[PDB]
Amino acid sequence: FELNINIINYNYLGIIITVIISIYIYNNSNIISVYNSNLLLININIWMKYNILDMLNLNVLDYKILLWIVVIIISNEILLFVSFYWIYYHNYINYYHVNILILNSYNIVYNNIILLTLLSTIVNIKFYNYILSYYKYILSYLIYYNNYMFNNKIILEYKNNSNYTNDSVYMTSYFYIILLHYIHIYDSIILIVVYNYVNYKNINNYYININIYYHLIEVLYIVISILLYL
Amino acid sequence: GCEAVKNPLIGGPNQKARGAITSGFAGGGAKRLGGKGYGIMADWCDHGYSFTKGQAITGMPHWPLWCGGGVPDKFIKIDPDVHFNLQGYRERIGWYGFFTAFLQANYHAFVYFVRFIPINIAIFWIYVNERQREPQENVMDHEEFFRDFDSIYLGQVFDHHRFAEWLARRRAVKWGYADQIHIPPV
Amino acid sequence: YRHWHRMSEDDWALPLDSMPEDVKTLMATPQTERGFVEDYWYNRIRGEATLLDPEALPSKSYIALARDMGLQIVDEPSSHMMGLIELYEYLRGASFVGPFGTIENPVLVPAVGQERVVACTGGVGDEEHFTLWFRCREGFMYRCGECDQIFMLVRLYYEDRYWTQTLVRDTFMSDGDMFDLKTLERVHKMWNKDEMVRWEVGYWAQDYVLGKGVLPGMVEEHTRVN
Amino acid sequence: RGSVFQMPSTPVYPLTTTKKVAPPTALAKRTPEQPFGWGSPVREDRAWRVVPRNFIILVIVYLSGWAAIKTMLPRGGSILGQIYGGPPKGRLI
Amino acid sequence: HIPHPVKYVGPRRYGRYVYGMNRPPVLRQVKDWIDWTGWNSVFGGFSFQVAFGLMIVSGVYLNNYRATHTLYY
Amino acid sequence: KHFFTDGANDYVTGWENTPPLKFPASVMKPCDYSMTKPIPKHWKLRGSGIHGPENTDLMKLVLWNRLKQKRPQREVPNINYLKDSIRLELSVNWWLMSCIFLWGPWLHWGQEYQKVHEQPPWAMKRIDGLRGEGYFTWFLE
Amino acid sequence: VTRYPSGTRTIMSPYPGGPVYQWLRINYNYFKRYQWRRVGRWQMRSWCYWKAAFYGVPEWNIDPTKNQWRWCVDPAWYGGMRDKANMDMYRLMVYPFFGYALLYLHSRFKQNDKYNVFAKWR
Amino acid sequence: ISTSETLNQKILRWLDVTGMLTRWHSRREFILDMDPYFRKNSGMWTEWERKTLLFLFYCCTLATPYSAYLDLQELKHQGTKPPRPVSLESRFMNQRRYDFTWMHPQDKFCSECRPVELECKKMCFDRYRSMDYRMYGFQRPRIQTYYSFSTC
Amino acid sequence: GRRLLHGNYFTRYLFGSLAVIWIAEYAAACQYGIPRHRNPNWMWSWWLEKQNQIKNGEIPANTPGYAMVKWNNEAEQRWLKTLNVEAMNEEFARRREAYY
Amino acid sequence: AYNGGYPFHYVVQYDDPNYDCEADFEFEEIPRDEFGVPAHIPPELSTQI
Ligand SMILES: CCCCCCCCCCCCCCCCCC(=O)OC[C@H](COP(=O)([O-])OCC(O)COP(=O)([O-])OC[C@@H](COC(=O)CCCCCCCCCCCCCCCCC)OC(=O)CCCCCCCCCCCCCCCCC)OC(=O)CCCCCCCCCCCCCCCCC
Ligand SMILES: CCCCCCCCCCCCCCCCCC(=O)OC[C@H](COP(=O)([O-])OCC(O)COP(=O)([O-])OC[C@@H](COC(=O)CCCCCCCCCCCCCCCCC)OC(=O)CCCCCCCCCCCCCCCCC)OC(=O)CCCCCCCCCCCCCCCCC
Ligand SMILES: CCCCCCCCCCCCCCCCCC(=O)OC[C@H](COP(=O)([O-])OCC(O)COP(=O)([O-])OC[C@@H](COC(=O)CCCCCCCCCCCCCCCCC)OC(=O)CCCCCCCCCCCCCCCCC)OC(=O)CCCCCCCCCCCCCCCCC
Ligand SMILES: CCCCCCCCCCCCCCCCCC(=O)OC[C@H](COP(=O)([O-])OCC(O)COP(=O)([O-])OC[C@@H](COC(=O)CCCCCCCCCCCCCCCCC)OC(=O)CCCCCCCCCCCCCCCCC)OC(=O)CCCCCCCCCCCCCCCCC
Ligand SMILES: CCCCCCCCCCCCCCCCCC(=O)OC[C@H](COP(=O)([O-])OCC(O)COP(=O)([O-])OC[C@@H](COC(=O)CCCCCCCCCCCCCCCCC)OC(=O)CCCCCCCCCCCCCCCCC)OC(=O)CCCCCCCCCCCCCCCCC
Ligand SMILES: CCCCCCCC/C=C/CCCCCCCC(=O)OC[C@H](COP(=O)(O)OCCN)OC(=O)CCCCCCC/C=C/CCCCCCCC
Ligand SMILES: CCCCCCCC/C=C\CCCCCCCC(=O)OC[C@H](COP(=O)(O)OCCN)OC(=O)CCCCCCC/C=C/CCCCCCCC
Ligand SMILES: [Zn+2]
């Protein structure tokens, strides 16, 4: 027989990661922060390596445990956006009569909605192929093109906007809510860059996580679009 | 230090006597180059699929999970008795060998960076390309705008080519290089 | 069981590359001296040699037929040991529910060691009480202080070892007549002729008996690039 | 060979048509000095030599180029500034 | 989940494609495809945009035309 | 379905609480001995009596759940199952079609009208002298 | 029935097509299968994130009793000397970090004029 | 022109120049278009799954050009954004407690300019250049550079 | 295959919630008697009268609001020094002739 | 009734003895099933046979 769980006795990434966090506080140059971020990325990858190596234990509950962890993380991301919506709507009584130019409801909203919908369709096709034990090379490069356009559009919008964060709480909330969504789009790039075909298929937690996360980002933008643009 | 470090090899005889295993490559047993084999067959070099040659070097990974199984003894190259038993390992590889071991321990991190940098370079190019250009005329005088509201506010939709040329001339006047540039006619 | 993961490819069959190359010694090794891989191929080579000889099957007794395929004839001792093994394995990830324990029929608590923690929850319905945990050690008839339910520890122990499927086989299975390599050759020629190999394990096995790389195409079969 | 679930439709073994001598690993057996891997030919381990060599070269080029820019070129806000951030030619300051 | 039969009642096979001969009209083919893959996805997908579009474009009459003709001052 | 559930959508291990309906009850049946008739007093307990593999039905359930994992061909599900598996995918695709062919045309029409008349076609025209497009979603005014 | 090479002959029309059409059909088929898919095959095989996770891990023995390193050794050190070397390298940075961290405290302490506590009132 | 085919056949042929329609109507053509490793699993697919996958795939790819057209128009719109009236500094507008330095804690470039206030930075970079300190950007006319989306 | 939520849960609880919100709001308006006619205009009576005068032609077209008030702030005094409504109207008239 | 009807393990056969789905990048071979059904015969038809 064997123990139900193969215990993990020792770990040293925790110390390294925690020290990396402290380096952000104790920096005397923003250049150190940039290089420190690479270290954090490296060590987080090692932690992800340990999760993949745990497959050797053949434990049925490992998939379930990680899936429910992601559910909790998703909830935290939703509640973080709720706080920004809370901040935005608290000062609702002070909006729409101040001498600032709010965003148009015709151009930005439509193309972004169309663009992000295509992103969902690409990920949906990836899920379908994952169900069918099949792969299509071009799909990943469609995501990169999709992400390239999103970055190009958002950069221009910020640069050409004629109002600034210090003009009103409305502008601050607009910029902040849009940035928060962008950061979650960038986190999606971090995840999707490693998409590959793995032959153990439906016992791979990465596929279900990516599908859930991409759907969350897109639905959040619908709420943002209704609140700010429409 | 040890013989293995001096003469690195993959899966030769007398591994225990040589003192160390310097290769992370695991598996083999393919009848042809790039064919079906055993083990995962991953390494820094000589694996996967050559883009330059358009040929497969090793087969798809054969995981020890449900989808695969163990590797026959004929083709096992990382003997755990030599792979582990790390007592005295730093003397068997020396300082330089210690440096190589540290670099090779981060193959997982290296693979991610290769797949992660290029899109960031694309995003960075957008910023660099735009930063070179002079900024667009974001705002103008409050009163002058309203005295010609229709032309300025609706000019773009009615005729974007003439409107674009008009913007260029204003930028030339604003930054004082109108006489130095020839704006094409529209 | 529900707590096991997906069947691996090896759970069905092993690759021929795992066949021991010294087949002549493999077929002469006693069962107690054969490892997991050696035992697997001994049974498969000997089992398929008898099954691929149709003309001899009808005259072969079930005892001999079971021996050739490596199947163990069941008896009360072996059945008892195997049954308690499966019960132990099932309880690893399943609930422990059964009839109320009494002196005549104590609750059986399988264990490998000398001790295992148990809880008593009383009887059914109103007789059910709060969990009362106790350490069930070997050699004592335990009596719950609340409901008077009787528990007993059953140890899966045998001669300095704990019961396992292989241990049961070695203890009770008896090696029969030594396998004759002539049968391997005779069946090999029956199903393998003129480049057609419908009996491939025997083809490899016969090649190993003749050394290695003697039969047609075996040199190319054993040559690998990595 | 690969998985046991992939097989030819017609099970046929080619009758050797060439006279090529058998490779040593094709006839090798397990030996006390080689308990594992006797079926696979020995190969050079390039990763042990190339990885540290390539890493050193990239670091040297990376650091050397960074040092050269900050020394040969005039002071500037960023590397791109020091290369293209100067005033137009003929603009006296 | 309530077990229930498959509601598709159209043709199950058109036959081998032979340069597009002996095949139904295009509109009938579109109807068959949606029957095969389910109308529930069509209605669900289009429901949101139809509701939003009708509400916005209804204002052309409800908000613009009626208001001009109905202002007591 | 996307999400994994131990009870119903258990694709990680493929465990099923009951056998297929194809098998005759004699061959295999669901593990239910709730209807067992009272045991005669003269019968004696030989086995543990503990719920587990000693019961024939549970043993066959465990055996089948392991041996079903290799099958010669696919067990084709009906179109209802296949529809449900990609319900979200199909609906998102139709949502994209609706955006292109329904939202796009009238949004383009509104902007063109706005160009000529200073306000969207679904808005009351102002008489207060303020300039600009004004609101878009009229019913939220 | 004549079987053409896959992707080279259309089934939509009895006419194979004109020279330009045939060139486009044949060459797209070649570009996809033998030129564009090089990139995909290269990324899938030579740069697999999951393969890189098992790099340096011992082969899995078919004999079940020869894999005891799975539970005898913690997963963080399945890589032998590589995993230990990576751990040892970060250990060397402990004291360099302390000096670096101590400098930051000095920097803040100085910038707040806390060293002039006695000189201020002398 | 070719009279060996109907008009419908000709239209279908050209829409099939990349083989999309042929793969849709032939299972054999579809599976052979897969790479060998994945063709191994093709036998298990039902026709409902195969054609449904293509439908989702074709709708996505066919819609990508439309999104590209929208994005290009968006880039052109931003490339020639009309100027807007200068904001009157109202009661609660442009309030500052400290300079903007979070981007450059040590260098403190353009402390008075906001993080993405390009025109303010341009004039600030000009001062630094006039002080013999190089800075990158804002020097090339927009119509003389590539990818500006501002050309006539 | 076992279901946890309503078979049409997403559409049911989105459109259903919107319907209930809309119907509740109408009920609330009826109870309090709130006027439901929509006005998109500012209600400053004096300003609306001036706008009507411009529409009638009593006040020349394109005349700024600060040109019509009895108190001007400093910024408006700056603009009044450069204001020429007559010139603006002539320029617009010239544009119309060129267009036609 | 598990995994959408896809078995975890199944047999695949190839007509060419020297065929390797990982080494070759050809586009003519059609894999067969355990019963020998070619892959371009869909399962809803082959399962009825
Ligand atoms: C006489 C010739 C007439 C030609 C007319 C023009 C036709 C152009 C079609 C372009 C379609 C691009 C669609 C992009 C989305 C991704 C597609 C995809 O999934 O590809 C998978 C495909 C194969 O992927 P895989 O993973 O191997 O296989 C996956 C599947 O299993 C198997 O995949 P699959 O085989 O099912 O793929 C189906 C299909 C799925 O996608 C579609 O079917 C979408 C179709 C959309 C149509 C868009 C037309 C745009 C035209 C606009 C023109 C505007 C003019 C304005 C004028 C203004 C005047 C004032 O994908 C493709 O076929 C993609 C195109 C393949 C070409 C690759 C070679 C390089 C480009 C060659 C271009 C040649 C143009 C010649 C023009 C001559 C004119 C006389 O990917 C590749 O081949 C690799 C990447 C390259 C693909 C994209 C190439 C873009 C080329 C654009 C050309 C048009 C430019 C117009 C500019 C106008 C400026 C004003
Ligand atoms: C035709 C073909 C042509 C081909 C041409 C090819 C040309 C190739 C050229 C290659 C060379 C490039 C050189 C430049 C590279 C960039 C360097 C740089 O400046 O980066 C930072 C740069 C900003 O820096 P900067 O302002 O330029 O430099 C200011 C100076 O640092 C001013 O100094 P500061 O004092 O203000 O700085 C504060 C100081 C703060 O210093 C301190 O606090 C320490 C001071 C005392 C230390 C004394 C020792 C005591 C012990 C210390 C212990 C420390 C550790 C303690 C524990 C942890 C906590 C600290 O910070 C530092 O020291 C900075 C470095 C710190 C170390 C970071 C790690 C670096 C490792 C790199 C190598 C890897 C490891 C090697 C291991 C070797 C083993 C054998 O930031 C960025 O790069 C931001 C943008 C992001 C990257 C963009 C990439 C764009 C790529 C464009 C590609 C174009 C492709 C075109 C294709 C076209 C196709 C047609
Ligand atoms: C007006 C126009 C504009 C509208 C804008 C709308 C904006 C919406 C924003 C939404 C953002 C995106 C979020 C979802 C992203 C993923 C989408 C996705 O993949 O969907 C397809 C996919 C469909 O799954 P499937 O298995 O294929 O289903 C097939 C069939 O649909 C049939 O499936 P089935 O029925 O057979 O059931 C299977 C499936 C069915 O489930 C689903 O499919 C879920 C679909 C959800 C879609 C989102 C709809 C909106 C939900 C609103 C919930 C509000 C909560 C209450 C807030 C109160 C505030 C005061 O089950 C699961 O997948 C289980 C998932 C785990 C659920 C964990 C829930 C934890 C929280 C429990 C409540 C806590 C409060 C207790 C209070 C009482 C205490 C006594 O969904 C998933 O698989 C997603 C599951 C993973 C993400 C779960 C996230 C849970 C977050 C919990 C937050 C709790 C906060 C509590 C405190 C709050 C107050 C302080
Ligand atoms: C004499 C005077 C005469 C006067 C005559 C006047 C005439 C007036 C006529 C008025 C007519 C009124 C009619 C009323 C009765 C309606 C009856 C009806 O059919 O109701 C039900 C009908 C449909 O409900 P249903 O029957 O439940 O739907 C059946 C489904 O198939 C259920 O099946 P299912 O549940 O399987 O459905 C599929 C489902 C299956 O679910 C799953 O597969 C499982 C997973 C579900 C959870 C998903 C989680 C998240 C997914 C992530 C992926 C996202 C992708 C997109 C990403 C975008 C990124 C930007 O999946 C989905 O549907 C969701 C996924 C698809 C994509 C979702 C996209 C985002 C949605 C959320 C945002 C929505 C707002 C967007 C706004 C725009 C953009 C910002 O409801 C409506 O249509 C709503 C009623 C609207 C009433 C409007 C009334 C006002 C307007 C009046 C206009 C006319 C006035 C003209 C003037 C007249 C003056 C006199
Ligand atoms: C912003 C403005 C608007 C922009 C819109 C942009 C739209 C982009 C759409 C792109 C669609 C791509 C379609 C590809 C079709 C491929 C078939 C084809 O044509 O193959 C022919 C042929 C095939 O030969 P083959 O295969 O050997 O056949 C021999 C067989 O024996 C015989 O076999 P066969 O008979 O089957 O082969 C021949 C057959 C082949 O074709 C077919 O039968 C077609 C069947 C499939 C059709 C499926 C649909 C295709 C997509 C339709 C897209 C519609 C776009 C609508 C846009 C509206 C915009 C308002 O028939 C044809 O060749 C007929 C071609 C019809 C072309 C129609 C062109 C319409 C242009 C409209 C312009 C409007 C401008 C308005 C300006 C307003 C200003 C206020 O080879 C080529 O494709 C030739 C390529 C070389 C062309 C050279 C062109 C030189 C142009 C010089 C211009 C100089 C300008 C100077 C200016 C100076 C100023 C001062
Ligand atoms: C015997 C009876 C026959 C009757 C025949 C009736 C035929 C009716 C044909 C109606 C055609 C209507 C076409 C409308 C197209 C409008 C396209 C348009 O506006 O494109 C722009 C817009 C994007 O522009 P942006 O600048 O980005 O602005 C919006 C976002 N910012 O793009 C789109 O709208 C793309 C979507 C195209 C929609 C096409 C609609 C086609 C409708 C055809 C109906 C045919 C009916 C036939 C009935 C037959 C009865 C026997
Ligand atoms: C190889 C190089 C690759 C580079 C490109 C690819 C990688 C890109 C990575 C993701 C980048 C995401 C950037 C997110 C921050 C964006 C900042 C931004 O835009 O801020 C401005 C925007 C609007 O401002 P205005 O200029 O007034 O707008 C007027 C419009 N004309 O919003 C703000 O001002 C808010 C700024 C919030 C910034 C938050 C980012 C985190 C910064 C943390 C600094 C901490 C320093 C202290 C020490 C601790 C170090 C950890
Ligand atoms: Zn008790």
Automatic annotation (TrEMBL), chain D:
Presence of keyword Transmembrane helix: yes
Transmembrane segments: 50-69
Protein name: Uncharacterized protein
Organism: Perkinsus marinus (strain ATCC 50983 / TXsc)
Keywords: Membrane, Transmembrane, Transmembrane helix
TrEMBL record, chain G:
UniProt keyword annotations, A-Z: Membrane, Transmembrane, Transmembrane helix
Keyword Transmembrane helix applies: yes
Transmembrane spans: 89-105
Protein's recorded name: Uncharacterized protein
Automatic annotation (TrEMBL), chain H:
Domain of life, per lineage: Eukaryota
Annotated disulfide bonds: C113-C120
Name of this protein: Merozoite surface protein, putative
Species per Swiss-Prot/TrEMBL record: Perkinsus marinus (strain ATCC 50983 / TXsc)
Entire protein: shown range: 22 to 173 of 547
From TrEMBL, chain I:
Superkingdom of the source species: Eukaryota
Keyword Transmembrane: yes
Transmembrane segments: 13-34
Keywords from the named record: Membrane, Transmembrane, Transmembrane helix
Name recorded for this polypeptide: Uncharacterized protein
Species of origin: Perkinsus marinus (strain ATCC 50983 / TXsc)
Source organism phylogeny: Eukaryota, Sar, Alveolata, Perkinsozoa, Perkinsea
